[PDB]
Amino acid sequence: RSYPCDEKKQNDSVIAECSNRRLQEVPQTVGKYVTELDLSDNFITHITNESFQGLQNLTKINLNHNPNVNGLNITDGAFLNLKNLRELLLEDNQLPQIPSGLPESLTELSLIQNNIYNITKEGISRLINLKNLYLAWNCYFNKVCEKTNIEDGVFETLTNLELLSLSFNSLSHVPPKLPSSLRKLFLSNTQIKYISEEDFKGLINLTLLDLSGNCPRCFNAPFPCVPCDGGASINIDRFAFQNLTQLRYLNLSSTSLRKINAAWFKNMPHLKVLDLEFNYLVGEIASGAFLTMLPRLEILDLSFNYIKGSYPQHINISRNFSKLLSLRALHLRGYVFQELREDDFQPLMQLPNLSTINLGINFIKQIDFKLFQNFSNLEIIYLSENRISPLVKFDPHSNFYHFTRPLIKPQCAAYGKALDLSLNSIFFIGPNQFENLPDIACLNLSANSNAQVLSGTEFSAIPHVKYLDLTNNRLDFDNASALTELSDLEVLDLSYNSHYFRIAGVTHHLEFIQNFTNLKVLNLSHNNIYTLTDKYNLESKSLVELVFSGNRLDILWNDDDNRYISIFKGLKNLTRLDLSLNRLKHIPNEAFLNLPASLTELHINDNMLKFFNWTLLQQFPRLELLDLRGNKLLFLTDSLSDFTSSLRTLLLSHNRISHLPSGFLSEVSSLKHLDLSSNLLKTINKSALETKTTTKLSMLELHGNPFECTCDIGDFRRWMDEHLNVKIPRLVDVICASPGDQRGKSIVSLEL
Amino acid sequence: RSYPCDEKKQNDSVIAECSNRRLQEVPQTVGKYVTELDLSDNFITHITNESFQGLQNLTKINLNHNPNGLNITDGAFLNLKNLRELLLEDNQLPQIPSGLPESLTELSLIQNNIYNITKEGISRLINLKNLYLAWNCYFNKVCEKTNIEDGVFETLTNLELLSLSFNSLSHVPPKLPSSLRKLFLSNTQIKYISEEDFKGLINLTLLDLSGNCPRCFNAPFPCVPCDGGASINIDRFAFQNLTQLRYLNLSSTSLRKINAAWFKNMPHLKVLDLEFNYLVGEIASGAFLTMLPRLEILDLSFNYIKGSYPQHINISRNFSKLLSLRALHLRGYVFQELREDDFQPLMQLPNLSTINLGINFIKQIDFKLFQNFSNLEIIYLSENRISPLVKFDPHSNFYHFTRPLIKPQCAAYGKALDLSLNSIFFIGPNQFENLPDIACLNLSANSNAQVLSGTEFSAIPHVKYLDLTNNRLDFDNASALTELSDLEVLDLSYNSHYFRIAGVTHHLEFIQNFTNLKVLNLSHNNIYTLTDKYNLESKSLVELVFSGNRLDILWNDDDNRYISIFKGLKNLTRLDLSLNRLKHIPNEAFLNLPASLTELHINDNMLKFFNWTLLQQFPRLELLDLRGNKLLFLTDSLSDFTSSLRTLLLSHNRISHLPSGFSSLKHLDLSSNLLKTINKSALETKTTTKLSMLELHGNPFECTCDIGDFRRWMDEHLNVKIPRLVDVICASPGDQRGKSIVS
């Protein structure tokens, strides 16, 4: 049992996870076999060459964010005897300079978010193995440093350097004498307003250039933003990129461009990704000479180029878009326009690989949906945040300018062609809503204030939908025919539906569910279901997972006539059931016994349970996960293993357990993970301490208990050393609440 | 000292407030002389022959919600000869308490289990004017029909108001007293009205038949449509002898057709509710509209046809016959476009002052049509789809939109236009072209990201009250909104800035440009940076709401740049600094708050420190609200720092000691603190009038002999009112928790 770090296996190389643990110095109890050491988010103030003594197998050290919330003091040569050290992360440590005597074995060095104003030869010129060097966020909106001092030729001796990041520094000009090994050069937010033919001298290998945020268009930035005088644009000589023949990635986001010189791309015919977000390029999107110079571009982002105060009728797309033969993804959010016509998108219909069209946040009122049938490989049509109506006729390493998360959930898009119409004005489903759509497999209509009474005919023009997201609407699905035109439906998400037509004796009528042969996942969370009117147990032979949290099972199960005792019983294939957040005080024995026999995972967290009948687990021989967190439980059984042989994970955090019964830390030999964190335990008793057969417990959580650190914590501490297979994570947070002189200390730190 | 009830008076006349007080039985220590006693929301289990004894003068008793049923003995109330008004709501009564005093003018038994309405319970109560029996046999498993025994009401003779709403009745009871003015029959499952149900009720001014055959749209109670698509069935001559009717409620009766004959003999009809029916067809023809020349209020909301989104609203020409109409409610018709053509019939109407078109999903409107009206004051267009123009309580009125459509504070300034919750995501150059002279304008919650530059409002340049709430506006430009010279109220609450520029945002200079701006609300704007070179000068600003911003950041500024940010607001009388995460205010910063202040709120910060001596700088301060902070320190010499302070609110802090000698003060709130005791030294006679209210409930008082010194001071100063005496509660010692401190 290592302490204070959690040691873990990773192929060959053993990692010490030692972060966010309130340490004040480098621990001297780090395993000598450890190869990586994450000491980030602590209170370390001093590093010497003693700090890492006899840790010769160290390959990576992360010291980020120390001291967390005057700088980290690193003595000259502190790291110098670590011969195998490759990666050194020293981010956000308030360093006033580059540490001297860094080891030449380094291939990766991060010094972001410090106060380094001076990049010197003395600091880094001997790091001749360096491949990646991160120096971002150092001389940044800082009254003391007007401009980063880059010693002339400092990087020229770094002949293996492949990645250099200087973003978020007051640079003013590109540093000369960069090594020609450079592949990736990040100069975002550096206050460079002019780029000449000589800035990229000898950089014949460059594959990425990032010049975003120089002369920004300030639109909701998470960092300080300041436009160039006159909101002017970055000035890039015609010939600045003429030698950059390997460039694959070019980021020109937020440079206030109004004009794109076609000649910039002349010698760059393999460019793959071009970011032009947050500029003023509507004119260029219409004439676009540069579009003819990009035969291999795959991703083009032109988002948020709208003209202020403008709402043109139509988007104006140059016919030159038809020259983007390799295009796969087009991002055009925030152009801002009233209607998309068949004709306006003609240039794109020729593109054989175009699979993503992103038109979110354009306030589009009307689209001729049939235009989408005329593409070869359209797979994602993203139209969230527009104004379609019913048709009745921060992390400092972020990519900040690009929409980087999947546009549509991958669980939904994996089914096939995907259409996202969330956050529009589709307040009911018009009879023509889906007319002339391609064969949609994945559909999002979330958050449209949609009050449709579903009747079995609304989705019939797109009958192959497999994943249907209808969350945050006002739908009525009381009709047994609701959604039954969707016979291949697999996943239905009705989370947060509030019913606007409640009829006493009808709502909620859930009969439609029985219709689907292939329905696997159903989310009825936060539907405030407190009444049910189905004659018999609804039966499904397919349903795998039912989410029923945020409803009123407390009312359904307090029914005087016990009508709802059996409501889940006909879910014959169900393995996962979520009954969280249903205000449950006690579940009636007969209601619990009628849960689906097939259950493998049952969540009853965040209720108000004060009683749990453990003996009812005998009825569930497949039960592997039982989640009782966030309740009000006081007692546990002293014979869990008489009630289950399958249970693997038992989660009991945030309850009021003060006592562990004799014979609880077993016998349940199937139990691998037991979570007792955040309860009222003052001690861990002898007898709950037994050892039979093999306590194959491999995770025991205990942090957050008011422990008593007298010699009554001695048993448990001895146990902890007998059973080393049992991991106790976060040992550092298993804290004494008493007596006063032990308070705040780890239960580990007290002597025999 | 009055206990356990708080006993205020109104005439000479005395009222006993004894509600929500955890009482087990009726107290005996009630001021023997009280006229009105309120005992609602308690645990009172029994009312007896003996429960109210010394009270010859009691005119009114309230026993609602006891407990949370109430056992009442025969003749229990007879000893009290003056009783006019008796309230027994939600008491779980199985029967009308027999032998009730004939002195009764008002009786309410709503929300009980009274399935049988007996001549024995009520027939001899011959002086009653108002009787409430609603919510008795309502979706009840044990009662299938309310039984109203024949002629039970016939004798009641002075009865003016009868309510039987929310009861399974199925038929109107026969034999009703002809002195009735108001008859409530909402939600009674009466599917049919005959010629005979109402004949000879010639003094009727109000009839309520709503919720019979409902259209079930978001009801806050159970709702069961008639089977079929079936409307209520009202006989052609049902209202023939109802000549006095002013108020008719037919909401939610699934009407598809209005029989004009129903109105043939109702020359006085004033208010007609037709919400939640199926009246689109009738709205387009409406013969019945010709029969209504005195109607003031017509509600036709939520009559939409399922699944249809017609291009235009189809209003009958017959609407021109509504000569007296003051308000038209047409929510939830659902239509795409409003042209001038479609509202012709209304432009006839000389007194139409309110047009309510909320929730119609309207895409566009010819706004100029609103000029062709004589007396239009309120154009309510909230929850539509207008775009940027370029190139519960059982006494509720459940069906009608009852609150003012627009804040009265806004509407008071003149013609009011409400375009909140539309899609005006920026302000188009044509947004307000051809509008009338708007004085009150609501643009709340439009995701509006307009950069205000001083020209956006030039077509309605006399706006006095502007609601710009819950949007994303940029007002950094010094010209922002300066085309609105007459602006008096600006509400910018919850504005989230989307174009932050370091060194510019927030720039509040535009504020100086107005000579009659009075009220400015910048709450929850997340202001943590300010770029005005000098103190901003307003001579007109009287109230500034600055809550939910970051004064903590502004005031911990290393260069002390924001020390004087409010100083130049020289007329400020009210300042709200709540929810600014304040742990301390620099002495310099506090000294620079306007000397004009009469009212200062710094509640719900995290103040661990307050410099009392600085109140010297505020000779006009009347109210200081320090609630919800973390203060422990009270000065012994408040008198030395202020002779203006009237109200001092200190609840929800951490104070445990009152200093000895602790003039102007009338109201001191020390409730929810950590006071274990007030000591001998903290107390000093004599009365004069001094302070007239002290709050102390929610303190963990030590109930030993120490508290006796206080228990005597209390008796020695009777003009010092202490409320919620029942909640001034012992924590020490073990048996004393948690008795009151009257013991």
Ligand SMILES: *[C@@H]1O[C@H](CO)[C@@H](O[C@@H]2O[C@H](CO)[C@@H](O[C@@H]3O[C@H](CO)[C@@H](O)[C@H](O)[C@@H]3O)[C@H](O)[C@H]2NC(C)=O)[C@H](O)[C@H]1NC(C)=O
């Ligand atoms: C301007 O555009 C460039 C090119 O798209 C952006 O470069 C990308 O930057 C991100 C984040 O710094 C890099 O992401 C990282 O990928 C590595 C895997 O190599 C992963 O371990 C990290 O967790 C992270 O996801 C990304 O690799 C880089 N793209 C390439 C091809 O190097 C840049 O972020 C944009 N600039 C700004 C300021 O947004």
Ligand SMILES: *[C@@H]1O[C@H](CO)[C@@H](O[C@@H]2O[C@H](CO)[C@@H](O[C@@H]3O[C@H](CO)[C@@H](O)[C@H](O)[C@@H]3O)[C@H](O)[C@H]2NC(C)=O)[C@H](O)[C@H]1NC(C)=O
């Ligand atoms: C259908 O459309 C809705 C609405 O556009 C999608 O909801 C959005 O989904 C993602 C969840 O993956 C949410 O993004 C998350 O944002 C937080 C930061 O606020 C961040 O912590 C997460 O990493 C993630 O980026 C997004 O907030 C949410 N939008 C709303 C309004 O809730 C939904 O996922 C779409 N459905 C399908 C099947 O794709």
Ligand SMILES: *[C@@H]1O[C@H](CO)[C@@H](O[C@@H]2O[C@H](CO)[C@@H](O[C@@H]3O[C@H](CO)[C@@H](O)[C@H](O)[C@@H]3O)[C@H](O)[C@H]2NC(C)=O)[C@H](O)[C@H]1NC(C)=O
């Ligand atoms: C309604 O319930 C469904 C089903 O429980 C929720 O969708 C499921 O959400 C979880 C994310 O909590 C998904 O599991 C996650 O998947 C990712 C990616 O493969 C993995 O990295 C995570 O660690 C985790 O396993 C699960 O895939 C997804 N199921 C499906 C079919 O999409 C859904 O989000 C709920 N909706 C709302 C609005 O809450």
Ligand SMILES: *[C@@H]1O[C@H](CO)[C@@H](O[C@@H]2O[C@H](CO)[C@@H](O[C@@H]3O[C@H](CO)[C@@H](O)[C@H](O)[C@@H]3O)[C@H](O)[C@H]2NC(C)=O)[C@H](O)[C@H]1NC(C)=O
């Ligand atoms: C301008 O438009 C906005 C949006 O319609 C108005 O906000 C609305 O104002 C009223 C307060 O007067 C809120 O109604 C209240 O609802 C609560 C909770 O249900 C209820 O307890 C109160 O009795 C009251 O009826 C309403 O919630 C609020 N709407 C939203 C979305 O916040 C605003 O008042 C209008 N401004 C002017 C100057 O008229």
Ligand SMILES: *[C@@H]1O[C@H](CO)[C@@H](O[C@@H]2O[C@H](CO)[C@@H](O[C@@H]3O[C@H](CO)[C@@H](O)[C@H](O)[C@@H]3O)[C@H](O)[C@H]2NC(C)=O)[C@H](O)[C@H]1NC(C)=O
């Ligand atoms: C932004 O702040 C303004 C000014 O404080 C808020 O309006 C003010 O709000 C209070 C209601 O909390 C109004 O007081 C009420 O006056 C009526 C008079 O009929 C009185 O009966 C009530 O007891 C109460 O005192 C006050 O009139 C009103 N001020 C103005 C100029 O209208 C406004 O509500 C804030 N906006 C938001 C979204 O919080």
Ligand SMILES: *[C@@H]1O[C@H](CO)[C@@H](O[C@@H]2O[C@H](CO)[C@@H](O)[C@H](O)[C@H]2NC(C)=O)[C@H](O)[C@H]1NC(C)=O
């Ligand atoms: C039907 O409409 C009438 C108004 O015509 C409502 O009667 C009012 O009810 C409220 C609340 O109970 C009282 O404060 C008013 O004084 C009543 N008006 C009159 C003129 O007496 C009645 O509430 C409506 N019915 C329902 C169920 O909403």
Ligand SMILES: *[C@@H]1O[C@H](CO)[C@@H](O)[C@H](O)[C@H]1NC(C)=O
């Ligand atoms: C389209 O994609 C296919 C599959 O990756 C690729 O083989 C082909 O070259 C692409 N067409 C282009 C780039 O025009």
Ligand SMILES: *[C@@H]1O[C@H](CO)[C@@H](O)[C@H](O)[C@H]1NC(C)=O
């Ligand atoms: C379909 O796309 C092709 C390009 O391959 C184009 O020639 C044609 O005009 C398009 N047809 C329609 C109806 O838009």
Ligand SMILES: *[C@@H]1O[C@H](CO)[C@@H](O)[C@H](O)[C@H]1NC(C)=O
């Ligand atoms: C269910 O929907 C279908 C089609 O709208 C209709 O025929 C049927 O009457 C509906 N059933 C109910 C109970 O409303």
Ligand SMILES: *[C@@H]1O[C@H](CO)[C@@H](O)[C@H](O)[C@H]1NC(C)=O
């Ligand atoms: C499912 O729904 C369709 C359409 O309502 C119907 O034809 C079919 O018989 C239903 N099947 C089952 C098993 O409910």
Ligand SMILES: *[C@@H]1O[C@H](CO)[C@@H](O)[C@H](O)[C@H]1NC(C)=O
């Ligand atoms: C039942 O559940 C399993 C997943 O546990 C799934 O493979 C299977 O398809 C489901 N059975 C049916 C009949 O849908």
Ligand SMILES: *[C@@H]1O[C@H](CO)[C@@H](O)[C@H](O)[C@H]1NC(C)=O
């Ligand atoms: C729990 O369930 C068992 C087994 O069915 C039953 O015998 C026992 O009485 C239950 N205990 C309680 C307290 O309900």
Ligand SMILES: *[C@@H]1O[C@H](CO)[C@@H](O)[C@H](O)[C@H]1NC(C)=O
């Ligand atoms: C309109 O109202 C005014 C004042 O309230 C009154 O003089 C006039 O008679 C009303 N007109 C009607 C009821 O037709």
Ligand SMILES: *[C@@H]1O[C@H](CO)[C@@H](O)[C@H](O)[C@H]1NC(C)=O
């Ligand atoms: C204005 O209203 C009058 C009725 O007062 C009507 O006759 C006329 O046609 C309306 N004019 C316009 C332009 O709508």
Ligand SMILES: *[C@@H]1O[C@H](CO)[C@@H](O)[C@H](O)[C@H]1NC(C)=O
């Ligand atoms: C303020 O707005 C005016 C009018 O639109 C414009 O001339 C000026 O550029 C703006 N000033 C600033 C500092 O943004």
Ligand SMILES: *[C@@H]1O[C@H](CO)[C@@H](O)[C@H](O)[C@H]1NC(C)=O
């Ligand atoms: C209170 O403020 C006055 C004026 O700034 C100052 O003299 C006094 O020292 C202050 N007291 C404390 C405790 O800060």
